[PDB]
Amino acid sequence: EEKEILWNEAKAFIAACYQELGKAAEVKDRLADIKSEIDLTGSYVHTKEELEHGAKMAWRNSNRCIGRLFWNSLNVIDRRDVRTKEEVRDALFHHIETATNNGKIRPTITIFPPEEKGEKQVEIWNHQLIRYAGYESDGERIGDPASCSLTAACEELGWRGERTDFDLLPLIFRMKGDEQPVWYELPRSLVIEVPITHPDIEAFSDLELKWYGVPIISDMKLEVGGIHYNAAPFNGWYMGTEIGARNLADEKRYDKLKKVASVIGIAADYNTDLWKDQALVELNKAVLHSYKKQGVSIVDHHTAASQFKRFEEQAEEAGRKLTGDWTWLIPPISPAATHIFHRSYDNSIVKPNYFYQDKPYE
Amino acid sequence: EEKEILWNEAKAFIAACYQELGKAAEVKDRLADIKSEIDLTGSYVHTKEELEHGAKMAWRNSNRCIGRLFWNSLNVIDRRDVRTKEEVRDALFHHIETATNNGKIRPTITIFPPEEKGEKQVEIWNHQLIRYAGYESDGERIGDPASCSLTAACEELGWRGERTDFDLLPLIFRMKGDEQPVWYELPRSLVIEVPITHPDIEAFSDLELKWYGVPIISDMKLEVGGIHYNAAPFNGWYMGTEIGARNLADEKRYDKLKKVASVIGIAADYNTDLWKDQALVELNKAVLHSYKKQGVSIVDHHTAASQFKRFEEQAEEAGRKLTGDWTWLIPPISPAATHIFHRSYDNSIVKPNYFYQDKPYE
Ligand code: HEM
Ligand code: HEM
Ligand SMILES: Cc1cc(N)nc(COc2cccc(CNCCc3cccc(F)c3)c2)c1
Ligand SMILES: Cc1cc(N)nc(COc2cccc(CNCCc3cccc(F)c3)c2)c1
Ligand SMILES: C[C@H](O)[C@H](O)[C@H]1CNc2nc(N)[nH]c(=O)c2N1
Ligand SMILES: C[C@H](O)[C@H](O)[C@H]1CNc2nc(N)[nH]c(=O)c2N1
Ligand SMILES: [Cl-]
Ligand SMILES: [Cl-]
Numbered sequence: 001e002e003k004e005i006l007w008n009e010a011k012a013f014i015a016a017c018y019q020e021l022g023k024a025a026e027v028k029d030r031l032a033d034i035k036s037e038i039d040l041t042g043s044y045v046h047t048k049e050e051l052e053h054g055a056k057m058a059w060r061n062s063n064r065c066i067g068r069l070f071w072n073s074l075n076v077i078d079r080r081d082v083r084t085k086e087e088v089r090d091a092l093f094h095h096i097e098t099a100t101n102n103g104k105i106r107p108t109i110t111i112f113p114p115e116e117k118g119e120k121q122v123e124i125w126n127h128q129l130i131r132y133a134g135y136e137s138d139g140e141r142i143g144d145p146a147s148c149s150l151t152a153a154c155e156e157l158g159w160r161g162e163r164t165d166f167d168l169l170p171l172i173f174r175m176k177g178d179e180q181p182v183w184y185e186l187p188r189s190l191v192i193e194v195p196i197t198h199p200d201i202e203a204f205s206d207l208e209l210k211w212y213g214v215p216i217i218s219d220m221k222l223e224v225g226g227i228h229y230n231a232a233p234f235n236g237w238y239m240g241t242e243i244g245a246r247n248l249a250d251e252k253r254y255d256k257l258k259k260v261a262s263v264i265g266i267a268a269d270y271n272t273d274l275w276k277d278q279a280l281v282e283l284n285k286a287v288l289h290s291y292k293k294q295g296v297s298i299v300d301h302h303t304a305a306s307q308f309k310r311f312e313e314q315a316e317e318a319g320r321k322l323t324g325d326w327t328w329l330i331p332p333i334s335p336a337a338t339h340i341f342h343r344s345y346d347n348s349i350v351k352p353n354y355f356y357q358d359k360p361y362e
Numbered sequence: 363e364e365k366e367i368l369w370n371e372a373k374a375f376i377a378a379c380y381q382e383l384g385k386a387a388e389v390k391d392r393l394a395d396i397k398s399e400i401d402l403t404g405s406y407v408h409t410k411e412e413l414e415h416g417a418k419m420a421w422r423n424s425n426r427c428i429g430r431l432f433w434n435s436l437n438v439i440d441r442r443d444v445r446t447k448e449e450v451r452d453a454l455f456h457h458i459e460t461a462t463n464n465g466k467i468r469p470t471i472t473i474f475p476p477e478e479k480g481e482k483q484v485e486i487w488n489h490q491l492i493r494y495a496g497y498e499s500d501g502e503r504i505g506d507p508a509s510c511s512l513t514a515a516c517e518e519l520g521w522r523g524e525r526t527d528f529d530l531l532p533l534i535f536r537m538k539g540d541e542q543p544v545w546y547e548l549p550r551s552l553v554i555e556v557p558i559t560h561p562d563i564e565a566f567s568d569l570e571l572k573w574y575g576v577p578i579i580s581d582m583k584l585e586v587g588g589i590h591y592n593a594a595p596f597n598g599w600y601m602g603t604e605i606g607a608r609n610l611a612d613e614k615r616y617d618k619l620k621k622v623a624s625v626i627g628i629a630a631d632y633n634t635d636l637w638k639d640q641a642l643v644e645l646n647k648a649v650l651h652s653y654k655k656q657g658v659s660i661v662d663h664h665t666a667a668s669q670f671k672r673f674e675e676q677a678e679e680a681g682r683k684l685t686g687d688w689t690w691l692i693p694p695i696s697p698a699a700t701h702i703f704h705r706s707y708d709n710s711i712v713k714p715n716y717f718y719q720d721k722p723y724e
Contacts, residue, residue: 245698257699271664272650274643277696281639288634302633327688332698334639336607337619341694 003038009226010034010044013352017053017225043116046227052076054224055109055232058352063345064328066304067236069311074234075099075108082112085175088122089184092171092233096129096190099235100214103192105297109234114227122231123360125150125172125181129216129233130191133167143167145252153361159183165254166193166210173231174360181360194294196248198286203263209256211243211287213296219359224352234354237297239304244284245332256283280333301331305338323348365400371588372396372406375714379415379587405478408589414438416586417471417594420714425707426690428666429598431673436596437461437470444474447537450484451546454533454595458491458552461597462576465554467659471596476589484593485722487512487534487543491578491595492553495529505529507614515723521545527616528555528572535593536722543722556656558610560648565625571618573605573649575658581721586714596716599659601666606646607694618645642695663693667700685710 011031018027037044046054060071075098079091091110099108113121127150134147143151143165151161154172157180161167168191174181192213198204218233248254260279261268268275291298299307308329315322324345335341373393380389399406408416422433437460441453453472461470475483489512496509505513505527513523516534519542523529530553536543554575560566580595610616622641623630630637653660661669670691677684686707697703 250698271668272654272662274647274650274662274664276664276699277643277646280696280699281636281643284639285636288636292634300634300636302636302638306633330697332703333696334642334694335692335697336612336694337638337642 003042006043006226007035007038009351010038013054013225014050017050017057020057021049021053043227046224048078051078051080051111051224054352055111055222055234058222058224058354059234061323061350061353063323063325063347063349066239066301066308066329066331066340067299069307069314070107070236071311073107075106077108077110079110080113082122085173085178085182088112088173088175089171092129092173093187093190095216095233095235096186096214099216100190100192103213103294103296105214105235105237107234107236109222109232111222111229112231114229118228119176120174120230121176123174123181124218124231124233125153125174125360126169126218129171129218129235130186130212130214131169132165132212133161133169135161135163144247144254149359149362154183157181157183168212192294192296194290194296196283196286196290197293198264198282199289201264201282201286203265204282204286206263207256207259209248209254211247213291214238215242217354219357220354221357222352222354230357237299238291239299239301239331240284240288240291241301241331241333244287245280248283248287249280284333301333301338305331305340309339321348321350322346323350365404368405368588369397369400371713372400375416375587376412379412379419382419383411383415405589408586410440413440413442413473413586416714417473417584417596420584420586420716421596423685423712423715425685425687425709425711428601428663428670428691428693428702429661431669431676432469432598433673435469437468439470439472441472442475444484447535447540447544450474450535450537451533454491454535455549455552457578457595457597458548458576461578462552462554465575465656465658467576467597467599469596469598471584471594473584473591474593476591480590481538482536482592483538485536485543486580486593486595487515487536487722488531488580491533491580491597492548492574492576493531494527494574495523495531497523497525506609506616511721511724516545519543519545530574554656554658556652556658558645558648558652559655560626560644561651563626563644563648565627566644566648568625569618569621571610571616573609575653576600577604579716581719582716583719584714584716592719599661600653601661601663601693602646602650602653603663603693603695606649607642610645610649611642646695663695663700667693667702671701683710683712684708685712 014030015027018024034044055076056071056074059074060068082088095110099106132144133151134144135142136148142163159170168186170183170185172181172183193210196209214235215238216233216235222229222232248256257276257279258268260283261275264282266275288300312322325347326345329340376392377389380386396406417438418433418436421436444450457472461468494506495513496506497504498510504525521532530548532545532547534543534545555572558571576597577600578595578597584591584594610618619638619641620630622645623637626644628637650662674684687709688707691702
């Protein structure tokens with residue numbers, strides 16, 4: 001059953017990939033080679049072209065992503081050659097550097113060796129390569145609550161955070177054959193952060209908020225033609241609402257709205273005053289302003305939705321079915337102000353794609 | 363097949379209704395009576411108790427409604443006795459008066475005779491009993507675009523609007539056996555309207571916005587135990603966002619955001635300024651303020667969501683399955699600030715319920 005799943009996935013992917021690349025005459029021979037390789041070895045190896053296009057198709061098929069217009073410009077880094085933890089560490093450091101690009105963010109993915117017998121070669125524990133730690137002991141909350149379990153796992157392994165609200169978690173990953181993951185502190189020179197100030201309200205800086213420049217999702221599995229790349233971190237630039245309406249605003253995250261209301265000088269006493277809504281807007285304006293002032297790429301939800309509309313038009317013009325998850329595509333503030341809110345999307349899963357996988361901690 | 367559908371629906375409804383009312387011992391005999399009545403007449407007649415509870419269950423089962431906490435206090439008016447267009451007109455006038463209740467809105471439904479052979483006895487053309495007309499000719503847009511087709515149908519029948527942005531449509535409905543509907547102008551003394559002013563910004567009144575007090579949905583079908591009450595208008599009070607984020611804000615409705623931005627003194631030039639979001643918040647604050655000042659019931663989306671959470675808790679505590687449509691339950695502004703956004707809902711259809719039906723115009 002294993003090889004049959006692999007072979008069927010391979011046939012579907014190679015045919016579609018080669019058609020899109022205008023190389024459909026080469027399909028027959030390539031499938032033969034692959035078929036022999038699966039018979040002999042129990043698997044097959046993607047060409048660099050297949051791997052690059054596969055990762056791009058996977059992005060294009062990500063139902064929950066509003067940023068898909070730019071799928072074809074994804075920068076794909078092939079690191080299937082790595083064998084050592086130093087090599088993995090340095091590849092992750094490099095990804096941060098090249099993706100960051102002095103603030104002019106380049107959407108990038110680094111692809112590590114795939115699973116063999118469902119046996120991972122490299123297992124990345126971080127949710128994002130750059131993220132803040134979280135602590136909760138004896139009623140006291142510090143940092144990012146979403147990071148509490150990973151922070152506790154790291155501290156079990158001999159790491160210790162300074163217990164600020166913005167401790168950078170170390171990189172943490174496990175090599176095949178090793179029992180424990182290793183961890184490495186992020187060099188601060190690699191990590192761009194943005195202090196959050198407001199264009200009009202000077203007191204906003206009193207909140208001492210900041211966020212990191214580049215979201216680099218590092219715990220999802222890239223599946224391409226039946227091959228499981230469980231370790232394949234990828235990044236774009238942020239949409240402002242992710243930081244302002246979710247990370248800094250959620251009650252189970254940094255929960256800053258009452259403090260925002262206070263610095264912008266409005267009461268936070270009555271639901272009918274819509275003080276949470278007003279606070280959300282000002283916090284979200286501050287996030288966009290601050291990133292722009294620092295020269296770090298960011299997109300607002302209105303521009304992003306206009307871009308996604310173009311993606312929809314491009315999909316139809318190319319004869320491709322569009323898939324999407326309405327519940328994730330709508331922004332968390334003013335969704336009815338975007339065209340997304342006013343149409344529906346087929347939530348079918350198409351491969352190649354990025355998938356969730358179980359956390360090795362927890 | 364007709365009677366079998368009816369009988370099966372009847373059995374399910376009577377059993378559940380009588381259980382909820384603690385009258386389960388009476389089920390057996392009532393089903394017998396009903397079964398004979400279906401055999402003889404091709405249908406059956408609800409008791410007043412069944413009709414009242416049925417309409418309440420239908421509300422409770424309305425997946426898209428955030429206001430369901432109060433399902434059990436629905437005021438049910440039984441007008442299955444009406445036979446004349448004057449009787450229907452006067453019943454509709456009465457519904458407006460008693461639901462409005464001098465501003466202290468009472469959730470109310472008036473139930474007209476049900477369909478016979480799928481033959482409607484009364485067919486209400488209005489979408490809501492109180493709504494504004496819409497016009498579009500030669501590039502010029504006036505009033506509510508959502509009302510354009512019904513407005514044109516009314517004008518075909520000898521009605522003429524003044525062509526303000528807020529012309530009240532007449533009541534328009536058709537009686538069984540009549541070829542054309544009749545229309546009646548709404549007495550202005552019945553219709554409460556609220557001018558929209560802002561608590562802090564005096565210039566907001568320059569927009570000359572207003573809205574009507576009571577949303578009275580009049581084009582849906584109530585289905586109870588296999589009986590189709592195609593004419594059964596119902597009302598609650600508004601949630602502020604329905605007026606501020608949708609009716610006055612949508613580009614295909616009144617489209618007021620640029621004008622709002624101008625009166626609140628912000629530029630409407632750059633997406634990164636989030637001027638639409640800021641305008642939405644101020645417009646929504648103005649709507650809540652204005653209704654409250656006039657003494658007309660209204661609820662904000664935060665309070666409404668807190669109420670819905672109680673509905674969820676009440677459902678589980680009563681052993682009832684909860685159903686809901688996440689895509690309609692989330693408010694159109696600051697949805698992630700409500701608990702609704704952060705959970706999922708089973709969208710199964712349970713009866714009794716309210717359903718869409720085809721428009722007799724268009
Ligand atoms: C270029 C800038 C990009 C922007 C502005 C963007 C925007 C977003 C946003 C707002 C989400 C919603 C996730 C959340 O609510 O937390 C999302 C989800 C997602 N994006 Fe993108 N994205 C970008 C680039 C990328 C790239 C380069 C990839 C992969 C190659 C990607 C794959 C995804 C995936 C897989 C998800 C959903 C993950 C999940 O199920 O949790 N995106 N994107
Ligand atoms: C008491 C105050 C009430 C509030 C605040 C309320 C709130 C809402 C809201 C915000 C919606 C969303 C509809 C839209 O986006 O246009 C809705 C939908 C709905 N409500 Fe309620 N509601 C109330 C009372 C009622 C009553 C009394 C009934 C019936 C007996 C009812 C039945 C429904 C139905 C059937 C829908 C969905 C209709 C459709 O599919 O378009 N509601 N409600
Ligand atoms: C590449 C990229 C760019 C950009 N601007 N934004 C993103 C956000 O994408 C992701 C990817 C993975 C996860 C998330 C955060 N959502 C939480 C997902 C989740 C699912 C199930 C259980 C959970 F606890 C959490 C967001 C990704
Ligand atoms: C009773 C009540 C109270 C309250 N505050 N709000 C409501 C709103 O409920 C409804 C009921 C019916 C229709 C709508 C408006 N949504 C449009 C529905 C729709 C569906 C399909 C096609 C359309 F053009 C329009 C809203 C109802
Ligand atoms: C296509 C999409 O489902 C549509 O715009 C829905 C979205 N959710 C909604 N939610 C509410 N409350 N009211 C609406 O009219 C809509 N419209
Ligand atoms: C339960 C619900 O689906 C959940 O809160 C979703 C809603 N939509 C979302 N949309 C985005 N973009 N990101 C999220 O994390 C979520 N969370
Ligand atoms: Cl994030
Ligand atoms: Cl309305």
